[PDB]
Amino acid sequence: KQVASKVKLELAQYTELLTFAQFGSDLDKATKAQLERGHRIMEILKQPQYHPFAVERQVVSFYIVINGHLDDIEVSKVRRFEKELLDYLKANTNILTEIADKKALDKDLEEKLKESIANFKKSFN
Amino acid sequence: MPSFDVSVVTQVKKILEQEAGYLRLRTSEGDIGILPNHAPFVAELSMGKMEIESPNKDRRDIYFLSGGFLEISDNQATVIADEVFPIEKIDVESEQALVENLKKELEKVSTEEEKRKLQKKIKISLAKIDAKNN
Amino acid sequence: PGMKEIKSRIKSVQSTRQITNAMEIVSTTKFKRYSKLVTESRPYEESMRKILGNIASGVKNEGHPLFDGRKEVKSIAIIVITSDRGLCGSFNSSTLKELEKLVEKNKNKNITIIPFGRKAIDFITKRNYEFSESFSKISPDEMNKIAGEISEEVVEKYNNHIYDEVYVIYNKFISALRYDLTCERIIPITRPEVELNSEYIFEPSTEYILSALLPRFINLQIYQA
Amino acid sequence: PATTFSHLDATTVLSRNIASLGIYPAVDPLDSTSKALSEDVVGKEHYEVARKVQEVLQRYKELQDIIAILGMDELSDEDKLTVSRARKIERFFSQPFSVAEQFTGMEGKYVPVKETIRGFREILEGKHDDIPEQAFLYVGTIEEAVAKSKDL
Amino acid sequence: PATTFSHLDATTVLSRNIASLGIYPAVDPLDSTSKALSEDVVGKEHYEVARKVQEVLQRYKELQDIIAILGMDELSDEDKLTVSRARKIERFFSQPFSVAEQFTGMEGKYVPVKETIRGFREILEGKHDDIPEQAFLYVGTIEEAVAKSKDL
Amino acid sequence: PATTFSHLDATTVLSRNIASLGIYPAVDPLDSTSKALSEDVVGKEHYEVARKVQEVLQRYKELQDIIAILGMDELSDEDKLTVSRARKIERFFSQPFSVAEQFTGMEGKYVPVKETIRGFREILEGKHDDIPEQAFLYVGTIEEAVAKSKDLAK
């Protein structure tokens, strides 16, 4: 609920703005950024068949795009990013177990998560 | 205390309008300045830096000027300019890179009209560097 | 006849709608962008015209081949400005039919043209005028000031008596609502309406300052246009 | 719906756009219409207020294309004063509800017709132009709207 | 046809729109489906180009409304290439059939799965943006298509 | 109506689009056809002119989709002249009726076959390009069309 609430409205708005994409060269700094996150959110919603995500995996999948930890990363590799991140997050940090057990994001766990993201982001292709 | 209104302008936009007790330019004949209550006057300004001093020397703003003209209008004095830069932005590394890179291409260029433009451009680059040094 | 047909046409026009609507807003912002850049060149113009104004008042009685006609009328040049893209309406329609009037209405048949854009260069090919050099798909970021180096070529050709007159056809932006198409002469300097009694002194005489002023005033006029 | 519309006297259209914007109850003021909105029924004051309110709200919905992409700055100078009223008008239509007490916490608010007319009538005239738009959100009478601006 | 579709594993839908253009076999690449088009079956080199082709063609169909009324002149540089490439792949799909020598007036040409995949892959990579779109009409292999351009 | 068509030597279709546009008699010039319209019967000029105006009006109908959403300025100079002529030809087909004299308040004007073919020819060739389109409604002869254009100027 924390992560996946405003995201639906954002996407509906992105769909409307998508028509202006062809004239991006001259279309404000603010609205241009809305598109860029609008591109990255679409790729995260996209997923392969016979490979369902657990709730804890989805929470982090949404977290990274909402806060904007993919906005410097190119659109191409945005799917590859979360694939490799959740592999790192499973074995190393064990934050997935934390999120799954409590079933909420507190201030303490969120700040713990943000660090582990930056760690993986400094090790990413 | 004794100040007059100065104005620097180019085709693109107006740059500034500050008060000044003294102003410094460069003419093709020699360096020139301007004091308050100066008589109406107009002359061409050669490729060289300019400097503006506030009344009771608050600050001394330093710029560059590739070409233009000076204009004095009973009170106010405007500075018609072609290209203008603040001295700080004139970095050596940015300009010098282009100097040697254009020199090799000057050899290959055949026509004399095209050479004179590169012969004119080399003056500008060196002048930007010369102004920044002193 | 069938609703399978109708259902397509709705989706066809509705897609068109969403782009023409988008092009309205994107154009709305872009003219406001260029309406500033044009007004920001006024301080330069004001300071420029004041100098030449004094020169006109002094050399009025005698006369000058800039302020008044040379009487030679041996050759004429023209500058045309049109858009690269289309969907303008009767914008490029008016411009290209206005220069048609100037080209026709001359004592001298020999005229040369300098077109800016695509709708100009395409038009000149069909009408078969004396084929000059052109410049299309212009970069605004690469300041149009630099792109306006055509100023250099026309002033040089006035010095050699290669051109005795020059015209420009452009659309002067008056307001957001309405734009007024215009045809002005550049090289035949327009003597100011009011005469100027402000009293200048020149370091390299009046002879040299005017020679140096013309190249800069031409580039200004083209850049403003 | 055609045979149903025969009997219908008025209509109230809930908008998701207004619901997403965070204005409750939603109730699109342009889509919603009534038989009773006329001088003969309600009065001359009530009528001309509602009309002016809708015309300004319509003029805002027209200039919604520009402000959404460009901004409030990148706009005509003369319309911005009428837009600043329109945004406050739309936000003033928000209303604390007695039923919502359980959720929102805020106490409810019944409002008779004469209280609303005055409130809207002053806004479009331009008496409470100096009052911020955030004060109008979820407040009852215009009396309480100006009161909340000082509170903030 | 609606209840028949369910029974089939592989379905090859033929579009009259494509037949009207005069490019047989007039197979619709967006409507044609197979339960065997998966990473499992045909590997990932096959599966990825197959979709990337369909992705390009789907975009072309969307932009087909614009170029009709507004024109190619009013179209982005980014999309301009994905139109011409889409038109070339569309026309490359057409090949001469052995049985339809009586119609096409050409010797029919068999093309194996390997040669097909490479041909379309090379068009996607932007190699044959030099070769006109007329040079792909009723040709076996990409080798022949590139040759035909200079041939005529 | 569908079956009746196959019992007729000549058929005159009346369209609501034409009537609504404010033109009477509201005869669709493309949908209306007659068996007699052939060089055999009507001669050379009659046939040649009749087919030409059909070709022009057809082109006007083809471009009418594009004009509706964009405008007249977009279509090419080649089309521009054919459209302007079409609109005049279309409006020239209108004429006042003797029965509808009380209605229209105009003397209904019987035009002979020879003077009609003369008119649509002159309009087609572009000898009446100078005349406005609002000088062709409820006229009759082409001689009266120009008289209406002079009546304006006064």
- The helix/strand class of chain C is alpha/beta
Order of helices and strands of chain B: EEEEEEEEEEEHH
Strand content of chain B: 35-45%
Shape of chain C: elongated
Subunit structure (chain C): F-type ATPases have 2 components, CF(1) - the catalytic core - and CF(0) - the membrane proton channel. CF(1) has five subunits: alpha(3), beta(3), gamma(1), delta(1), epsilon(1). CF(0) has three main subunits: a, b and c.
Organism (chain C): Fusobacterium nucleatum subsp. nucleatum (strain ATCC 25586 / DSM 15643 / BCRC 10681 / CIP 101130 / JCM 8532 / KCTC 2640 / LMG 13131 / VPI 4355)
Keywords (chain C): ATP synthesis, Cell inner membrane, Cell membrane, CF(1), Hydrogen ion transport, Ion transport, Membrane, Transport
GO molecular function (chain C): ATP binding; proton-transporting ATP synthase activity, rotational mechanism
Can you walk through the features of this model?
Chains D, E: Belongs to the ATPase alpha/beta chains family. Chains D, E: It is found in: Cell inner membrane. Chains D, E: It comes from Fusobacterium nucleatum subsp. nucleatum (strain ATCC 25586 / DSM 15643 / BCRC 10681 / CIP 101130 / JCM 8532 / KCTC 2640 / LMG 13131 / VPI 4355). Chains D, E: This is ATP synthase subunit beta. The structure is cut from a larger assembly and holds one copy of chain A (125 residues), one copy of chain B (134 residues), one copy of chain C (225 residues) and three copies of chain D. Chain A is mostly helical. Chain A has helices at 7-17, 30-45, 55-66, 78-93, 96-102, 107-121. The longest helix of chain A has 16 residues, at 30-45. Chain A is globular, with a radius of gyration of 15 Å. The N and C termini of chain A lie far apart (31 Å). Chain C has a four-stranded mixed sheet with strand order 2-1-3-4. Chain C starts with a helix and ends with a helix. Helix content of chain D is 49%, strand content 3%. With 152 residues, chain D is an all-alpha fold. Chain D has a single domain (37-152), classed as Orthogonal Bundle (Bovine Mitochondrial F1-ATPase, ATP Synthase Beta Chain, Chain D, domain3), CATH 1.10.1140.10. Chain D contains eight helices and two strands. The B-C interface holds B 7, 9-14, 27-29, 39-44, 69, 71, 73-74, 78, 80, 82 and C 37, 40-41, 43-44, 47-48, 50-51, 143, 145, 198-204, 208-209, 212-213, 216, 219-220, 223.
